[PDB]
Ligand code: HEM
């Protein structure tokens with residue numbers, strides 16, 4: 244289920260983080276604009292970039308922490324606030340977060356693994372509602 | 381579902397509040413110790429006590445608001461905080477609340493209405509979880 248999924252992703256965090264983030268960037272090309280050093284690079288080129296692996300891993304590490312702290316897939320208000328006031332997110336709207344989770348859910352469904360995709364869909368929706376109440380447009 | 385259940389209970393609150401609270405007290409006789417004037421009385425006698433109906437209704441008026449304010453059966457941290465800080469609850473532990481929901485879920489399953497008993501069970505567990513986080517033993 245949801246808790247096992249967190250253990251699965253953490254077990255090979257580097258791999259899952261890179262593949263899911265690329266799935267996100269290629270599904271929503273407009274999103275790459277927020278990350279100027281990823282522009283004009285193929286998937287393999289990015290997988291070779293030290294900063295790419297490190298950053299994506301850090302993004303997913305925090306996502307897993309938030310997911311582990313949640314109750315019945317509902318994130319803590321404090322975690323939502325933390326994501327909203329991070330300077331790196333100053334610019335962002337809930338729309339950007341919805342797209343990430345759509346790509347994440349689609350990735351899980353398309354993989355071979357037995358992820359609890361329904362819970363992740365729920366988690367993403369609840370997280371987006373939480374960002375909204377936290378003041379994100 | 382859960383949201384419709386809130387509307388159903390609100391539509392005949394006094395009746396539902398008394399029957400469920402009576403179900404609670406009769407399943408757990410020991411819990412009546414927290415309510416001084418309820419010992420040694422039959423159900424019909426309690427229902428004729430103005431104080432019994434007035435307080436049970438107020439208890440359910442608030443319970444429905446907490447449920448209404450919840451996201452995915454997960455109550456707001458602030459509502460959990462209010463329940464723990466209420467002076468009338470200074471001597472309670474999460475066990476008392478757990479028993480109340482066991483009785484409430486049993487009541488719904490035994491009735492003939494189409495209540496979403498599974499959701500109320502989840503709500504009860506998540507609320508107990510929230511009470512513990514708010515400092516309740
Ligand atoms: C709830 C999901 C998300 C989490 C947990 C998260 C987490 C993080 C973290 C921890 C960092 C700092 C990285 C470091 O330490 O170097 C970061 C940076 C950043 N995030 Fe997020 N993020 C999320 C969603 C998003 C979304 C949806 C966007 C926009 C499509 C976004 C855009 C950025 C950008 C532009 C940076 C700075 C760029 C960089 O580090 O190269 N993030 N994020």
Ligand code: HEM
Pocket residue numbers: 411414415435438439440442443463468469472476477478480
């Ligand atoms: C989350 C479920 C609960 C809610 C929303 C709730 C709500 C309330 C409210 C609003 C009052 C004040 C009523 C007034 O104005 O007189 C009250 C009083 C009280 N509650 Fe609770 N309560 C809950 C659970 C419990 C439990 C599980 C117990 C322990 C069996 C309990 C014991 C009491 C007592 C002893 C009083 C004061 C005695 C009395 O009013 O006659 N409550 N509660």
